């Protein structure tokens, strides 16, 4: 049983165009930040907005951050046969380069994310606030082809270190 | 004889739309999947589809990772004058890295491509199991300008190593 | 109180499409030529135009170069939930690498600004001449959630070097 | 007088869509192809058309490399405030890197050029033959703003090395 037909067609048997939540756990040896996109030139982008103090001493009451979601590699040029997981690979180019488990208690932010698609043009969006962000969660499965929607929204934790990936590679140098 | 002219007309004398089956053999002195597309702003971008379980031991049913068919180049935005041999170059960036002759035999996957053009805007679709991939083939030539189209979906066997790329990197090392 | 809520709705409460004059000044520990843009597919492209002559002695009457706007990172892809503070870092890739105070009282350029976005398709340009680019110059924040219009061309002088970041580089190597 | 006003209007004064010749010589130090456009989303592409044997013995009756006009740096998103000289830098990555006004003699290719503007959604083509490529020529300016366009395809003859882009690199190794 092929997902997907030569002429085409998708075989998968089917509120839900972005979970609740969004979490930060370990995939591919990556500490990872996910979250789920159910349902042309379907793309999808990630900005981090947070009021921040520039080193030159300047407030900035809503500042706006790139999160990578596949522009680099295309991966945000999305095939919506079924819900998907996006990732953002939290590395030194990251703006949560330095988020732990830690300061995510103390931190504010909110990732906003912006969906796009086609003619058809439309946009759906959504936000996660930092207490949106569960550290240590996974998502379960929904592909099983059928898409069982009930799990769409539910996470699980999955022991996941408190330390920032700064952190990680600091601790690294000296070890 | 010019393929188009200088007003921009192309000067090309034509189920056939992709290929039945996609191939894997070397051009250019690189390990490549080929398939062919046949017929604005036409793009094409391909997907792997598969099963997988991460190394932090999470089953991922259906896991979809990047092809790169020109992304990086601009050789995804195709110029149908006539059939085209899309290629993807297997490197260390590839999901097919280790892809060997052998383990295609106990390998499953399914790569699906999507080609989407212009206002007009239309996608077409397609998908190539691992039984649809035949390692050691390459296409015959349909343009002779005139298009055979008897041949758009022939193959034929060539001299290709049974090896992936990463084993023919490791023997070069030792070797 | 969140800027987006989860349904994508944005929560701010609002001749105001760009900022009269652009501004040269520090960010983030770099030289910024920065100006404001106010209000799908939303992208946004700054061309440099200048009369130069080539090393091989050709006049351009009018040439056009590349300002680095967000093109490599996605940033240029807007997310306009109010004023957005555009940003392009002067580095040695910038046509503006060895422009310093003192030059810019010569010099003659002319940067044109082309936003664009959704169907909808419309197109928003504006231009800064050499004039209209403020050394040594900071906006004043227009977010408080609520927009000061008020203030959206309102800027302010700071404490900023008068030389380029090509003589910064320079007096480095020495010193 | 500038290039266009404060609200965008431009202040340029006007079969002459693409120039009927391309050309190659030096600019800013670098051997470079370069042709004419004349007249939302104005992008441009270039493909090199040409039938060729790949080292595995293969003859390519017709194959297609890509031309790089901007498609790294943006500078294929077109402003046509007037007629613009579009360059391809002949670097190792190009398919021209060892083109030189020798090899031209015999050489058989053909480059063809895609415009795509805007909704309105229109592409204009072209083509150059290797007898429609100049080498050791240079196009004549048309900006005055007035575009004296009598003068779009007119080019002539500037002191141009034979060599190639390569036949340089190696001509220094030694040397
Ligand atoms: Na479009
Ligand atoms: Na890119
Ligand atoms: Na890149
Ligand atoms: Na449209």
Redesign the interface.
């Known amino acids: 049983q092929?997902?997907?037909?030569?002429?085409?067609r998708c075989n998968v048997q089917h509120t839900l165009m972005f979970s609740?939540h969004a979490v930060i756990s370990?995939?591919?040896?990556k500490l990872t930040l996910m979250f789920r996109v159910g349902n042309?030139?379907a793309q999808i982008?990630c900005?981090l907005?947070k009021s921040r103090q520039?080193?030159?001493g300047?407030?900035?009451?809503?500042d706006?951050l790139?999160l990578?979601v596949?522009?680099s590699?295309?991966?945000d040029?999305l095939?919506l046969?079924?819900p998907?997981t996006i990732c953002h690979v939290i590395d030194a180019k990251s703006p949560f380069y330095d988020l732990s488990q830690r300061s995510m208690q103390t931190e504010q932010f909110?990732v906003?994310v912006?969906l796009?698609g086609?003619?058809?043009?439309?946009?759906?969006?959504?936000?996660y606030?930092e207490d949106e962000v569960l550290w240590g969660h996974?998502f379960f499965?929904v592909?099983?082809?059928k898409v069982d929607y009930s799990q769409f929204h539910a996470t699980f934790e999955?022991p996941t270190p408190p330390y920032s990936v700064k952190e990680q590679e600091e601790m690294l140098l000296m070890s």
């Open positions: 092929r997902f997907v037909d030569k002429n085409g609740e370990m995939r591919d040896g042309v030139e982008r900005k907005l520039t080193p030159e300047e407030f900035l009451p809503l706006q790139e990578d596949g522009f590699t295309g991966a040029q095939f046969v079924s998907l909110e906003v912006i796009e086609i003619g058809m043009t439309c946009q759906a969006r959504t936000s606030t996974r499965p592909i099983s082809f999955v």
